[PDB]
Design a protein around this ligand. Sequence first.
Ligand SMILES: *[C@@H]1O[C@H](CO)[C@@H](O)[C@H](O)[C@H]1NC(C)=O
Ligand SMILES: [Ca+2]
Ligand SMILES: [Ca+2]
Ligand SMILES: [Ca+2]
Length: 509
Amino acid sequence: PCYTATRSECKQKHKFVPGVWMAGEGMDVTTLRRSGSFPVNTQRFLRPDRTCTLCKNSLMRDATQRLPVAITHWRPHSSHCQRNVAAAKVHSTEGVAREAAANINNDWRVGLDVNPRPEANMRASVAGSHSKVANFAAEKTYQDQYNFNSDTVECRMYSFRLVQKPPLHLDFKKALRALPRNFNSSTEHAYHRLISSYGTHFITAVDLGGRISVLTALRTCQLTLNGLTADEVGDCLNVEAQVSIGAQASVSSEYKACEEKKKQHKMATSFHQTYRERHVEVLGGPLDSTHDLLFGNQATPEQFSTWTASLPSNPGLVDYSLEPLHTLLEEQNPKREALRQAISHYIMSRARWQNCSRPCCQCECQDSKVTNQDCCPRQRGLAHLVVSNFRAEHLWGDYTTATDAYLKVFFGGQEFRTGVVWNNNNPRWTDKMDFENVLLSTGGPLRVQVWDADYGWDDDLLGSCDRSPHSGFHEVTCELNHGRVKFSYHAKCLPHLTGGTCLEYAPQG
Ligand SMILES: *[C@@H]1O[C@H](CO)[C@@H](O)[C@H](O)[C@H]1NC(C)=O
Ligand SMILES: [Ca+2]
Ligand SMILES: [Ca+2]
Ligand SMILES: [Ca+2]
């Protein structure tokens, strides 16, 4: 929307249109990072006719500015203001409780009386009682709270393009002079010398404007694990035997003996991980809005208004379009071909492992204690417990006959039973017992209980064993009151976890 000026119009101090020098800049296509290279020279401002293109400045007083020849169409977009405010909140909870109790009581008593007629008497009495109490309890609370939001403001003001015949810069010409004839393995290094110094693509169409971006994340993860165990045993025995004779002669023997035993086991475990990230980017502004805009979650509209009012003087970067470098060479020139091949390969190289920030090169999933949004481990302490190779040695279960024994597995509030072989004093079983995902840390103590099936309302207990689960291919041996029981298990940690009880996170992130 402007024209060519004349000799007198092209005399006084006339600054260039804002942000024009950003045009034609090289940019890596791999990283989308501005290396700061200018394959094209935009310094010239006079056509061979010696006139210059003064162009009026909308949204900037009522003056005119200089248009360089390489520029196609400087459109002063009147006004375009966009805002995008996105938010997201996620909550997750999980709560489990197991409780178990067992009460057992038994009593015994006998009484005998003999009264022979010819001057004789006799009495006897016996008593006894047993009691066992067991209590298991466990609580498991998981809660995760994730939060995200992003506020972006854009204001497009300027935009313009280039042609396919712009004046190439002298330094780029000198680089081309030292550049070899065509492509080869030895000369490819020389191409690298060009690439990092001039990028792979150059800006052909550009749009100028101001921008704010504010990203904020907040990831919190809380684990609480509680476990209680309480055992009581009480055994009271009472014997009282008295014998008297018709002639004065008395004997009395009274026994009393009662044992009490208590066991308590409490274990609390708490994990808390909070990660907060903010990130703010600003491209427009003459170092003036920086006074208040960068800091503080809220910006008052007044300094924002001052920023926008001063914005036309200094533009930023909002959008760009890329043109391959080989487009800029001569139409009849072989060294176009041998050029881009290398770049193409080069691109793919940095696409594979040299630069892998965007594809995830599958990365880790944890915040790594710095940057790296990723994820806290949604499950911790879980293991795939597998119990196998049940065997026992030298039992004494059945008194008259051979031992009829069977085992019970108690873990994490779960009650599990096996098959019973008959009449064996050292049997073993081929059961492949699996627990799927269980918490070893707060599953309580693994109990293996050896019972003797005597077909009665009061079964005979050969014994029991308590062990603390740990990760690895472990073997467990237990000596009973009579006989012994041996077996093994392998409760491997779930991935991203290791250690004895599978709580600590092995890698950095
Ligand atoms: C690569 O080929 C060019 C000519 O095509 C030659 O000048 C250069 O020496 C070669 N480099 C090698 C074979 O390493
Ligand atoms: Ca028995
Ligand atoms: Ca039995
Ligand atoms: Ca038997």
